[PDB]
Design a protein around this ligand. Structure first.
Ligand SMILES: CCCCCCCCCCCCCCCC(=O)O
Ligand SMILES: CCCCCCCCCCCCCCCC(=O)O
Ligand SMILES: CCCCCCCCCCCCCCCC(=O)O
Lengths: 252, 54, 237, 267, 267, 60, 54, 60, 267, 54
């Protein structure tokens, strides 16, 4: 039976009784930096049980007229435990991730979700001259949501959040070129993606650069009949993997 | 002088004249494929004839 | 003074030439290479990845997520058609904009098989059986399930495994086909019919949906690189 | 790079199910058409040689063109080097996230005669100078300037009526690859410039006439062509749907996913 | 490729009949002249080297010429590639039914001065661009158009006063050979286009001036030359008797088989 | 800089020359060859076939 | 470098410079004859000295 | 008369080229070399020498 | 020429003091950063190839430009050869005290049409002559002079519209190296000329038109470019702070050492 | 003909055509370092871990 997993990281454990396979990045598992690729020449810090564990974000409600949600990935964990405290005292850092999206409903509900992970998901603005400001591009472990309409040009600094363009000007059906899974309420209950470190430099600052984006888009909308449960949540759980830091300084 | 194989559906000769490796010609004959890292990026391998979920 | 003689084709700029040129910055030390995940060596690795197909254009679903959903009901008769489109992976507006149909619009010739995957995104208590057919050209489009069963078909039974693959084989008189629309190199039609009904229990919604995917097999190839007609410009940005 | 060939097959009645799968795993099915029907043995001789990254990207493409006039105060041209003002090369390079290549540079220079007023206008052959200034150096402010001494900046000279000038450029970068997309700011306070403009620092290219304005004005035009060699590419990307609007950012106006038809059963 | 030599012979009186045969079998007689008369031994050193298919077809032949004007709104030229507008290459290629070759392409470009009205007309050297668009791509609609960016379409640039431009083209086809004759339709309903126009899809060739119209109009003319290399040929054919009338089809007006004489015994 | 010297016959287009030229479509895969019946190698094989002769012209 | 025989009534040298086989020179020296497939396309062979019909 | 073909980049003056050129004074006898102290081979040997830093600018 | 790599280190508590030294000895400390803090092992692949004396100095730099007119009595140009009239090459060569190299010489010649008064002005191609006179020889006094016979002085001829002329010069000197600085006089009585003018004796370079003034004046301009090859260098030197004022000597006006800031703690 | 190593981050060929050694190309590949004659021009050697003055 392929339907059961068990993931153990630190002092936390996930158990699943209804699951698909585990998608591993681009075939690569996360690992520490080697001596041939290093450029910063002082010794890095590896706490490795205090940071590499499962942190759970907030929950969102899947409604019937629901369009989608997104998260910027080294930003939702910026106030979570000892992971968000090492980011404030250090200048560099590199991390791999393990994402577990989970949503349960009965055999009398239907719907489908696409869970992708997009590296360098640069987004656009509703006014054609400006760029979006920081408060709309991300939130502290709170979802920013798409909408089925088009944001007008009368606003100045807001993200263009039409779902069929995916915020980036591309087709939403072609997002399956990135590592992804589906959640089908007929057969599935969760989705698990393992992502390595992807950048053009061996280390980077985690406060000026978001290098991953997790999107959850309902392709088939949620439907049920009269009498069934109307409230269906979605919960996301992220665990850092093989994290290390460089450049101690003041607290920023 | 390098002697290569001259793509058909016969050989040719190639000599480098400059001191920098950025001055050479294009590669044009490096045929390598690895489609499995995009099409099957899963943890446990999946046999085609077996069902996906047991 | 070695005696030489210059041929036609001298002092010309052919934009696809293969020559050596002197470097403008001599003895430069480039940054050493790093192992970044996800290296692309061939463009065919991109085209062999599934992509959702918008079969439901219908004049007002294109600015919506409803273009990707195929409606499925419970009927009072038998043998109705679900969808149907001609197999033109670079000229027909259904398969035009997908991940396979964008690589083909950079080339002129194509050859190989095509996979079509269908997923049933309905309730876990609903059943059904479908017919997924392919008809080579020479006749028209099949108007019944009696005419569509004479071609190449598969019967899909919806159960625990929620997907099925209809593998369109390479049936052609030539070795390659044109990407642009051409009646000499047509490829045929792909249809879908009801085999039995969608039987549903009480307190379950009858209307379900089906998603569609498309990709390429391992014998697919392309030829004669050209420009794409999918971009414009008026002035410099 | 030959493709796989077809294997003959027989009628089956068994437990194995190649056609049934689960697309919920994020795993594309590996079925061949010799599993769903009866096939014959066919030897394929087709090759995938024309779709390589070395063959898809190694062609010359125009990136800019600028004009400058002979009989003019401060008549010369400048250009800050980028690959985002044209629509055809920008869509080809943005199918990937990270790129690493050498370069080949080619210039095409023309000239035209302006409506002068003198009689017996006859000019000799024109000579042009194209100078490259890396970021931080001194820039020219006029035509008769000391900054055109080109002691350490690389430049090129060319006389009209010959083969076009050409030179090679290695992989000049500070990182390990070029970046087509940057999701971040340049300040640590998360203000100001957001996007790919924080990584673009390549220099400026200057153009002028070396001759003097004899008896009639002359207006010239240069055209610049890029050709990537020795290409590596990582992390592919969906192609762009909407039309480009600006150069510094990725702002767009929303558009439908395809064009429409009149029914779902319309062939 | 030496020819056969002559064998000496003697007076005969026998049962063997070389001169008597039957032409009703569709079989050409294999008699040599040393069977019907007395011959001497002659060593032939002649060769059949100049009549090969590689020597008969590998010469340059003009296929088209078009003009385009500098000082004109939408002044540029186009041509859909075929080998049926000239009368001399069409008769040479239609001695066979199926052909398969590589190609060599050469262009000859001239210029001429048009009657302008200004004084002191003096123009610099002219530069031309010739672009090839495979079927399905975007086409130019005017001279200052975005479609001349030639990002992936092959083009060529040339300055006046040098050697003519030349390039090679491989065997580009969808079938296994080129077809000079097609006896059929393009529709399955047997309507519409009948003939060789159903197989012709090779692209379009565009031509323009890259310079600007300075002070006087200039009218240019390009000429295109074909040269087949690495030729194979199958199924020979009778040569054409009547004169060609159109390009798309083989319509003719009937004519006599030869010219006449005044008697059957007239020498 | 190797010293060379150009002879007469430079930058000319002789229509029966035998030279090499750069390809405009690099790395192209041609269709494989097939065995079609009736291959012509020399034009003398065509001339060695019988043909009916019009000896009776006579003006009408 | 290929050394060939240079048709007379003496040798020459030939080197290929480009990577594609469509860039080479013409063949011009492939002398092969098979006139029998057009002049005698019959089933049973016919001897010259014998009569055609017996 | 060897057949040649000239490429783009002909008759251009790139200021950082690396070519050979004919000498204007043939068969010249240069003065023999002497051992002068303090030979510089790399510019990094100059940059690895201490230098006093003006930290106290302050407008006057 | 790879750089040194980093060695891993451990926490210490010992008698050895790498950070404490004495700068009074005239000896630069040889400490690496793996002595003052805890480091990791890092393999460096960087090279010092671009900072060599062979790479820093072997680029072409303009040294002079002069003009001469066709329709003029005694219209020709002269130049006494030195490297002290430009500001960019003078600062690069004066980082050392003694230099020894070969030379590469390149000339860039243009032309311009002057406002003549005749109608139908049309001139043929211009030819120029550049002559080198070593010190002591006969000098030209006009354009039609016997001194242009160039029997033993090396000269060069050039027709307009081709590649620029180029030649090589060996290490021509009387001493064992060139001297950028000379602290002394030329007389034994210590009077008169003081400085580098006592060592400069390299010759004069002459330029003229070889054609005749047909029907319209023409003004030409030559530009001279230096490129040192096979370089040796001795006794480095501080770079120049003030601006150059003259050519023969090192006279200056005093200037501050840097630019100012508003406080000592201003970041 | 000299065969050298062609700086990268593959070989090339070089032949000399003229009779004088001042006509050759630039060296460009003579990497030699001696920083000790400028940075430590002292008489008695100084160990890094020992104090400078005893
Ligand atoms: C005369 C010499 C001219 C030298 C020209 C050098 C031009 C540098 C080329 C930079 C390549 C830019 C690549 C794209 C940058 C990016 O995408 O971020
Ligand atoms: C600048 C590049 C120009 C490229 C020109 C390519 C022209 C394609 C040649 C097609 C050959 C046509 C042969 C005859 C076709 C037929 O008889 O059916
Ligand atoms: C046509 C032939 C021209 C010959 C030109 C020869 C020029 C001699 C070069 C002298 C080099 C001067 C070096 C600087 C002298 C110094 O610094 O003291």
């Amino acid at each position: 039976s392929d339907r059961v997993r068990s993931i153990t990281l630190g002092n936390s454990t996930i158990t699943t009784q209804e699951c698909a396979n585990v998608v591993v990045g681009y075939g690569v598992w996360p690992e520490y930096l080697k001596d041939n690729e290093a450029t910063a020449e002082d010794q890095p810090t590896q706490p490795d049980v205090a940071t590499c564990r499962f942190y759970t974000l907030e929950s969102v409600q899947w409604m019937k007229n629901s369009a989608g949600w997104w998260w910027k990935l080294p930003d939702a964990l910026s106030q979570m435990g000892l992971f968000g405290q090492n980011m404030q005292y250090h200048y560099l850092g590199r991390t791999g991730y393990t994402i577990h999206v989970q949503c349960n409903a009965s055999k009398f509900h239907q719907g489908c979700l696409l869970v992708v992970c997009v590296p360098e998901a640069e987004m656009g603005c509703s006014n054609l001259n400006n760029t979006p400001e920081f408060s709309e591009l991300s939130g502290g472990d709170s979802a920013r949501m798409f909408t089925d309409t088009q944001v007008g040009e009368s606003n100045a600094k807001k993200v263009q959040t039409a779902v069929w363009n995916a915020g980036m000007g591309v087709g939403v059906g072609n997002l399956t070129i990135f590592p992804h899974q589906w959640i089908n309420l007929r057969t599935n209950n969760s989705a698990t993606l393992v992502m390595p470190y992807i950048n053009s430099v061996p280390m980077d600052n985690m406060f000026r650069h978001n290098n991953l984006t997790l999107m959850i888009i309902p392709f088939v909308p949620l439907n049920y009949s009269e009498g069934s449960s109307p409230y269906v949540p979605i919960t996301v759980t992220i665990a850092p993997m093989c994290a290390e830091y460089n450049g101690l300084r003041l607290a920023s | 002088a390098q002697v290569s194989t001259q793509k058909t559906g016969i050989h040719y000769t190639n000599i480098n004249y400059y001191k920098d490796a950025a001055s050479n010609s294009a590669n044009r004959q490096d045929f390598t494929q690895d489609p499995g890292k995009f099409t099957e990026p899963v943890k446990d391998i999946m046999v085609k004839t077996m069902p996906a979920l047991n | 003074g070695l005696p030489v003689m210059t041929t036609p084709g001298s002092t010309q700029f052919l934009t696809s030439d293969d020559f050596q040129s002197p470097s403008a910055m001599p003895q430069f030390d480039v940054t050493p290479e790093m192992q970044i995940p996800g290296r692309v060596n061939n463009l065919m690795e991109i085209a062999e990845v599934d992509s959702v197909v918008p079969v439901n254009n219908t004049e007002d679903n294109v600015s919506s997520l409803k273009a990707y959903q195929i409606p499925v009901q419970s009927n009072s008769d038998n043998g109705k058609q679900v969808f149907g489109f001609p197999l033109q992976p670079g000229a027909n507006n259904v398969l035009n904009r997908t991940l396979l149909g964008e690589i083909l619009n950079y080339y002129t010739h194509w050859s190989g098989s095509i996979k079509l995957t269908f997923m049933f995104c309905g309730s876990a208590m609903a059943t059904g059986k479908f017919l997924l057919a392919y008809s080579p050209p020479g006749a028209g489009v099949p108007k019944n399930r009696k005419d569509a069963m004479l071609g190449t078909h598969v019967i899909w039974d919806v159960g625990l495994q929620s997907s099925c693959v209809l593998c369109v084989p390479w049936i052609s008189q030539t070795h390659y086909r044109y990407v642009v629309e051409d009646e000499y190199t047509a490829a045929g039609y792909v249809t879908c019919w009801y085999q039995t009904n969608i039987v549903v229990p009480a307190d379950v919604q009858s209307s379900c949906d089906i998603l569609c995917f498309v990709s390429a097999c391992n014998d697919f190839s392309v030829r004669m690189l050209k420009d794409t007609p999918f971009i414009r410009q008026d002035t410099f940005y | 790079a030959r493709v796989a060939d077809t294997i003959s097959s027989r009628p089956t009645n068994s437990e194995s199910i190649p056609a049934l799968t689960a697309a919920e795993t994020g795993h594309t099915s590996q079925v061949v058409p010799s599993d769903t029907m009866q096939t014959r043995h066919v030897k394929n001789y087709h090759s995938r040689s024309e779709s390589s990254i070395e063959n898809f990207l190694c062609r010359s493409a125009c990136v800019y063109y600028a004009t400058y006039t002979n009989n003019s105060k401060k008549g010369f041209a400048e250009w800050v080097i980028n690959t985002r003002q044209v629509a055809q090369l920008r869509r080809k390079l943005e199918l990937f996230t990270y790129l690493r290549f050498d370069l080949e540079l080619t210039f095409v220079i023309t000239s035209a005669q302006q409506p002068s007023t003198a009689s017996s206008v006859d000019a000799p052959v024109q000579t042009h100078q194209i100078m490259y200034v890396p970021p931080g150096g001194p820039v020219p402010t006029k035509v008769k300037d000391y900054a055109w001494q080109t002691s350490t900046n690389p430049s090129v000279f060319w006389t009209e009526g010959n083969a076009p000038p050409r030179m090679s450029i290695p992989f000049i970068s500070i990182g390990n690859a070029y970046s087509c997309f940057y999701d971040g700011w340049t300040q640590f306070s998360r203000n100001g410039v957001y996007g790919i403009n924080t990584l673009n620092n390549m220099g400026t290219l200057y153009m002028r006439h070396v001759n003097e304005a004899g008896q009639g004005p002359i207006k010239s035009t240069v055209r610049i062509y890029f050709k990537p060699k020795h290409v590596k590419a990582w992390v592919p990307r969906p192609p762009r749907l909407c039309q480009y609007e600006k150069q510094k950012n990725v702002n767009f106006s929303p558009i439908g996913v395809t064009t429409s038809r009149t029914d779902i059963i319309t062939t």
